[PDB]
Design a protein around this ligand. Structure first.
Ligand code: A1EDS
Ligand code: A1EDS
Ligand code: A1EDS
Ligand code: A1EDS
Ligand code: A1EDS
Ligand code: A1EDS
Ligand code: A1EDS
Ligand code: A1EDS
Lengths: 190, 189, 190, 192, 193, 190, 190, 189, 190
């Protein structure tokens, strides 16, 4: 149950609204349209409060809708502030795509976090012409995902295509070697 | 239930076994593997009884599996006897494909029978590459069906593709003009 | 149901197979492809036994599939023997259509039988153009039915269209006055 | 469930199920809810028995809660059409269209066992849709009741007015009461 | 849960739910399937914003698969009725009445993010019952498509014949393709990010 | 889902409570008893605040219960203020009945709005006399609705009966021509 | 419905028992244990009637259980008679594996028949040790299937592994080029 | 329902927000992503309030998702304050993994609390190669968990593997001897 | 349920929160982890308010999870304040165990309350060794419960084992005679 937080009671908020106060956005669920619209609004709200201060996007999500993921992706690239990303626990599907889309040099993963990449999933039923339409669409969607992943990791599109043909699980250090993140966040002091 | 008929001498058969004794095969249900396997067996059995007498295929079917329909189609083309076809009631999907596959000049429809043609149906769920494999296969299947329909009707492949893009209902008279059947069977005496 | 068995020589038959020996065919259920295919076969079998003796079609049926009914209809008109019809209990939908398809002068109903006429039922779900295709098809079907009903009853096509717009229940006497049957079969005893 | 009876005959061992054995003695069992399948089978048996002998009586055993009105009329009209007298007897219970067919037997040959029950009521139905569709259904079911009440009046001797009151609600009658009403001619007293 | 935003100002701390904060900047979120409830809320928001200021632009964010055609026309007719220009932007996806409403924004102020997708198609429906009932439903859904195609032709500049052919089946367009087609006026590009 | 509006000069309202402050009532759902009871209460509250200022009824509804619709209709006719009506999106069944019940000259429709008229729907299960009771009640209700519709539109009762036998869809312009509305509201400026 | 066949009635059998009389076995369903046990018994019965006469195995099946398929495979290889195979309509999964296991030179397909090859499918749920057990088992099963397929087609195991990684659909002529069958059965005369 | 507590001055909190005011975090349910995200946020919020005061993590949980458990585990190791842990009632699966992850010398269990350890669970359905990918991943995950448990308890990897092969129930006293906790909290005054 | 609200100064609280102000905790439902965690928190909160004043635990509960009950049990024995217990209505399973866990001399029941004791319930489905593990665990659990019950009632462990073999219903007076409570709380009025 979402706990209520008391600052210094004096002032009270739910935990996630208190995070937003520090310019932290929680992407901690499956990505559907509602989740994306919320995150888009939060990003635009933070830019309006300060168009130069970094924003922090916490990712612990199995992914979800590709179009919903691109709503968030395009909003990240449109705003002025750097958006840092960190994988907490797990990032798969569009979750890991967004992790890789954080400001260059500010993409992180905790030491035991897991990153998964794969090709998109879909579906089609009906006449042959309708199956062809869905196939052409999902294949075009895969090409768009692979091109951007190639641009943000430094790997070739051919390697991205090969490495996502099947479910591919990466450790935090492996995600750094791959170019999906920049640093494995080490503990501060203790 | 399936009635029993007596008769020549006093013999009792179920009505459909009696039909087979006159070299008539009833394709009167949705086409699945079990239906196709039975019809293939009946066709081969009739050819073994007499390799020169015509065979008669009665079609009142909404169609079904494409591969099951081709099992029947290939057996018709393989055996020596002519296989006559007649649409009674309705012939759709592979049912109308098999109606058009009868012996040239021996494909019929009763006056108020209906013929429907359309493109094949299918599905696909999974990774983008699995969707592509499923789409490529169903498109090849549609192309295979359309080529034969072009040969059997005399229409161009372009017209077959356009006319099967959506559900197309044809009257018996329209089916003859289209080339799916040769004659509308008219009431005798 | 528990269909009783009758014994006669040396022949035991279920009650319905015994009927066929007298050239009587029972149309006593909803009309589907299975029922139509069996009745078409029975009609052809009876003609092969004797191409001149009348056949008798008993009808106690709510109707059913239009194409299944036409399989029977066309087989009736194709074969040489006269096919008499009689409504027992109720004839609705394609059941009353087939009742009216008997050899003229040999269509009957029992005094308390009911006949119902009405327009065909159908459905359509999908794109606008798919709905239009299904509508044009079921309208063409209704015209085909009304055309034939007009020929076999003597009513104008416009009258048939009007009387079948809604469910229309007819007594045996009214079915005769309407032209659906030729005579109400009355008891020749008390 | 249904036992088989075997009898040494002229042409050798012959086997019947108990219900087919009853039919060989011109006994027809109406012992279930009346649907189209039950009515069509009973219509076929009545015509078969008349073809075997057009003057010998037929015996219709009734233990049924009733059912479809049109199915019941298929049996009713077949009874009135054939030449042989059709006797009726209620065993256990005859309700709805069951008691209608019980009263439809040959005059003087309508019976009920001493503890059998007879029930009469008005027809049941349903209707869902536009107002004009409900009107069509209401007119039809009301016509059906008038038809049923008229024949019941002819079969029992009671006026149409009394039939309307006595069938407005479920009305249970004893065997003696049924005889009294005219639905049956005599209550069958124990054979010796 | 819809998060709450705190605005530290020259007087202190103010709290709104995130969407009420969007409305304060004259931004309306069309981010779900379009049913009657969604349309009635958006119609109310458009009328409220015009009452607050009849000349400031309004911004309609669209990430929606579409839905009811009559619900979408409630929104369309309110956009055209009010005085302020209504800008539209496709975020993520605009399909069915979603892409129709995207094309209905003020001319020159219809946008899409670079990776957003636009889909156009013909309306969907159903019908079950008597033949004359099927005919009525078919006539109605076909008239609705003529209406949609007529307005879509006016908003895009394409002919009604081309729109009919291009919506016969599901048609997916990229942002640039939506601009070339005339459904949007500009692909909103990132300034250096 | 329902947004809250912040209005300068310290009040926060849900959007529908804000509409009521402008004497606007939203009939935007299927009409059941709860919907009617709330709308009746709103109408009485607005009259108590001001007995001469117009009230505005927004209609985007598929209709619903006839008695619930008449609860709204009778309250409209009872109160002193004029009740203007406008069809936005769609008005069918009791929805279109209430649209035509607005103050004469103040019944509107947006240009692309749809109006649907039809006869009432119902059901009946049981004894023959019970179905007769249900049928008599539905026909009475139809007459009532038709008679009022005739008075509100100027069309004869015979034409209303014919035009509502089946589902009848009308454009905004067709609704004006029929007399169900007075004006097609055209664009401010535009 | 399985029809009854009358020879010269005189003698009557169901259609499939009449086929068996000609040493024809129908593999026309999904392969489960019951189907395999039946076919094993039929093969042994035919060998007992004549240990030198060819046997004919008709295949129109989507496949099924791998162990059930190997029951049939091993019985084919154990008996003395040649077992001819023919793809009728479709053969996939173990169906196509059995098609390829027919006597060399007597493996056929009708011209429009389809052959599909793929890797085996399975499942596992539970502790990590149990998932490992199922994985090792299904991988071993794939190696056994690929080795035999390599022996009966002439292709290398590496090529079989590559070509079955995904669903692979072959035409009759393609199946012959691949080595899964020997001849495409052409029509005899007409 | 969650009770409301009053109190110092007159202040009202729900009982769990009152716990957080004393730097106590309740891990009292099955561990899914939503639970982990909330606990990660509470840990970071407490560190922002005071980076030197201990934090107290109450555990009464059957466990749940392994990745969600590691989200909590990594946040505990990342922040500066010591995070104390105590098992109340029961700690199983990732719940017992997190109990063992507390600050050295500050991992507790009430006397009648239960600790269970076992290997991770999962599933897999599809082609042989998909089953292999799923098995390889869950085996790597089990190896990752076992390595940390070895470091946190002092037991060898061999013993951890044997002791988690099947469901293993431990008493509080047994959990201390095993090295999963440091002390059994005994009743005071 | 509709929990009423009481008002008092200036404080409005639901009836259960008002109870806590008097150091009364309500254990009035089946015992699950959620209920246990809340009661543990309440106990610690009350001790933090005053480590010397008695706490009062009302019990009207069918029991539930054994581990959840022990969370409460151990918290009761850990804190300094005495915890009084009283059975209201019924205390069964872990509910009667916790009733017996109150401070000696301060365990009560209302005159017509019922107490039930019995052995724990559990399950086990799978391999022989898995069933043995679950059996040994639930037997160890029963010994732990019987050991403590023996200490707090004064009965031998063997007597407890015998009396809990089956469901055992006790009156308030019998619960006192058994040692589960210390006194039957009688009315100090009429
Ligand atoms: C309808 C066309 O217009 C689009 C434009 C309008 C607009 C934007 C950004 N849009 C582009 C866009 C949209 C979605 C994602 C994205 F990456 C860019 C914006 O960022 N703000 C400032 C703000 C936002 C949220 C709050 Cl809560 C407070 C302040 C703004 N204020 C008035 C209009 N407007
Ligand atoms: C590898 C198997 O290829 C076998 C070939 C063998 C064969 C055929 C035809 N098969 C080819 C085939 C198969 C399917 C469809 C098709 F178009 C051609 C055949 O027709 N008969 C005669 C017969 C059949 C059924 C009965 Cl009931 C009685 C007699 C026959 N008797 C022994 C072997 N054999
Ligand atoms: C596919 C070509 O079909 C032509 C023709 C073949 C045929 C017919 C009738 N077909 C036309 C037809 C079909 C359906 C309905 C209809 F109104 C007319 C027929 O009636 N008989 C006699 C018979 C039939 C059933 C039995 Cl049980 C016993 C004897 C017959 N014997 C060999 C071929 N043949
Ligand atoms: C289609 C219109 O005409 C039907 C008519 C013809 C006929 C009758 C009586 N039908 C009238 C009828 C039908 C239904 C109910 C009813 F009350 C009367 C009949 O009774 N038999 C003798 C018989 C019947 C069943 C067997 Cl099992 C054996 C012998 C007969 N044999 C050939 C034609 N025919
Ligand atoms: C019933 C017939 O008339 C309706 C008319 C009346 C009206 C309108 C506009 N309606 C037309 C309309 C309706 C729906 C959509 C559309 F495109 C135009 C309006 O915009 N306002 C101002 C306002 C609105 C919302 C808020 Cl929250 C605050 C202020 C207003 N105030 C009193 C009446 N009225
Ligand atoms: C239990 C161990 O023994 C096995 C052996 C016994 C046996 C066989 C073959 N088994 C080997 C086997 C079994 C399954 C498949 C397979 F490839 C080989 C056999 O083929 N026949 C002849 C026969 C068979 C079926 C009929 Cl219907 C009539 C005659 C036989 N007769 C007695 C024992 N026996
Ligand atoms: C790419 C994002 O990496 C962000 C980094 C930023 C950050 C952290 C820690 N993140 C790393 C991280 C994330 C998840 C777990 C974990 F172990 C460490 C932080 O702890 N605080 C203080 C704070 C937090 C919650 C509240 Cl309620 C109030 C204050 C903070 N304030 C602004 C940015 N920021
Ligand atoms: C993980 C280490 O746990 C040790 C200790 C921490 C602690 C306790 C009790 N723990 C032990 C414990 C836990 C569960 C049950 C139990 F019987 C004893 C405590 O009682 N209080 C005071 C308090 C609590 C709740 C509120 Cl609402 C207000 C005040 C406290 N304040 C800071 C740390 N701490």
């Amino acid at each position: 149950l979402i706990p209520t937080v008391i600052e210094t009671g004096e002032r009270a908020y739910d935990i996630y609204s208190r995070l937003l106060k520090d310019r932290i956005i929680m992407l901690g669920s499956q990505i559907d349209d509602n989740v994306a619209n919320s995150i888009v609004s939060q990003l635009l709200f933070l830019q309006a409060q300060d168009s130069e201060k970094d924003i922090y996007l916490y990712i612990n999500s199995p992914g979800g809708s590709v179009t919903a993921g691109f709503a968030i992706y395009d909003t990240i690239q449109h705003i002025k502030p750097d958006v840092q990303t960190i994988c907490i626990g797990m990032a798969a599907s569009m979750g890991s795509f967004l992790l890789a889309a954080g400001a260059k040099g500010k993409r992180f993963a905790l030491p035991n976090a897991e990153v998964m990449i794969h090709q998109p999933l879909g579906g089609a039923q009906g006449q042959a012409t309708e199956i062809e339409i869905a196939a052409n669409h999902i294949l075009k969607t895969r090409e768009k995902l692979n091109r951007i992943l190639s641009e943000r990791t430094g790997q070739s599109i051919e390697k991205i295509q090969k490495d996502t043909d099947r479910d591919n699980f990466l450790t935090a250090e492996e995600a750094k070697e791959y170019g999906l993140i920049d640093e494995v966040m080490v503990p501060e002091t203790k």
